[model samples]
Target: DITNEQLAAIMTNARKTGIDVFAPLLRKYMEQYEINTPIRISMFLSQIAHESGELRYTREIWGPTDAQRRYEKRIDLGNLHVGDGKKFMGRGLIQITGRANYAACSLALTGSPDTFLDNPELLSTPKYATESACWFWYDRGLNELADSEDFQRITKRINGGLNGLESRIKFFERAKKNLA
Candidate 1:
């Protein structure tokens, strides 16, 4: 798990894309779930490596693949969900998407405003990104959204947000028995 290529990718992206903030994301998750073991960290990284963007190979993830201009424009963390050139694409390691997400992030901090595009640094900041990830992962309830036994839900959240999350919990529960 330590050698996961995704880890390398996120680290690099975090510096630039601010997606590698998962290290701190892990800390927050542990705090909320009371998880305090190196093994848990390994599991978290492995699940995300496969879920978010496999060893640096994350999904293009910006907006609908059929949104006119969004037909096939896969921006990394630049403009993922801009919605047919809308510029609201949430493309980061943790799938930070939509006006709502950017707005939430902005309000959390003083200067943080609707800007997940030009300055990915907000998401890059360890504290901000980590807290944001944890907030996103809460998913109201149910299993952990991004790094728990519910991996598919994690993927859906990365792509569909709340709706995806709601459906995935049941799937994660059913799938957990077979997960290795």
Candidate 2:
């Protein structure tokens, strides 16, 4: 299990209060998802630290920038309706975006596809936020990538690209050392 100290060490930018809230949740969900190994834990923590801004933001800041505007009606993201873009924007620790992902995560977590769709803010809560990230990591078989130390592939898998690869790498390195 990861300790609060270890988590705080890795998520250097996170507040102590945030670490206090999230560390135990991370352990619980990581154990549930079998992300219990040091390597897996490190990888998971690092990615989420970057994704959530060291536990600062659960919902994506909705600037509706050009890229965000494109989220509307993007078939690949299952944003089929006019308002689906902002409605289903990123949420949770890993920022599960799109209607499709929300539905999938909802089904896996709550046994109902509409759980998150009906209330996306639930994913932003501490418990679900942590569980959702673990669910995504396990659902995507990211543990294998972590075991192989394939950081780039893991980033690609999570971000659909390497948007914050450098920051993620820094977190990973810190987590590795802290876990060691």
Candidate 3:
């Protein structure tokens, strides 16, 4: 289990990026799902990292992008996308795709299709996205992350992928135990 102090230190290194946020949020999920806290904290971390980070969205992760989607865009407004013209992709924290995922996201948000299609902002909000991200991580095939590891590319998959997953959990166990 992660102490609040360790979480605080991790947050100290935070830079409004994925790596900084994933582990803590994973701990949060563990608190709810895993009865054994310290054993697999990083599993919780990696999955969330994958979803909460870049693969989840399109924007200037390093600095700022004037093109970032604004709160004004209605959910049905498909104008919010990745490309300028040839690259425009739909907007949201999860970048929730297809009808199925959107339907799932909508259910996670407000128990209705209208929530996702009407108030797209829920996709970007932190608390709301947490539930949505977890729901995305809830299954296979569509689940981008699970038990895989690729720290070199951790920055990308944290948007949600099953890379370097088990190893990260091992790392977190080591951390929770201080290698003892």
**Predicted model with the maximum lDDT:** 2
RMSD of 2: 1.1
29, model 3: CA deviation in Å? 4.7
Residue-pair clashes per candidate: 13, 0, 24
The segments of candidate 1 whose C-alpha lies over 4 angstroms from its true place after superposition are 1-25, 28-44, 51-68, 71-86, 108-121, 124-127, 139-155, 161-180
- Model 2 agreement with the true structure over 1-180: per-residue lDDT tens digits: 678988989988899999999988998999999998889989999999999999998899989799999999999989887898999988999988899888999999999999999998888899998999999999898999999999999999999999999999999999999996
Off by over 4 Å in 3: 8-13, 16-30, 33-36, 50-95, 141-180
Measured on C-alpha atoms, candidate 3 has an lDDT of 0.43
Best model per TM-score: 2
Instruction: Return the candidate ranking by TM-score, descending.
Output: 2, 3, 1
For residues 1-180, write the lDDT of model 1, one tens digit per residue: 222233443333323243443444555554665333333333344434433443243223444456525432454323345342444444334546445556666665445565554555555454554455444545432234333445544455454555444333433342233232
The global C-alpha lDDT for each of the candidates, from Candidate 1 onward, is: 0.44, 0.91, 0.43
The C-alpha stretches of model 2 lying farther than 4 A from their native spots are none
Window of ten residues with lowest summed lDDT in model 3: 82-91
TM-score, per-candidate, Cα-based: 0.44, 0.95, 0.48
Candidates arranged by lDDT, highest first = 2, 1, 3
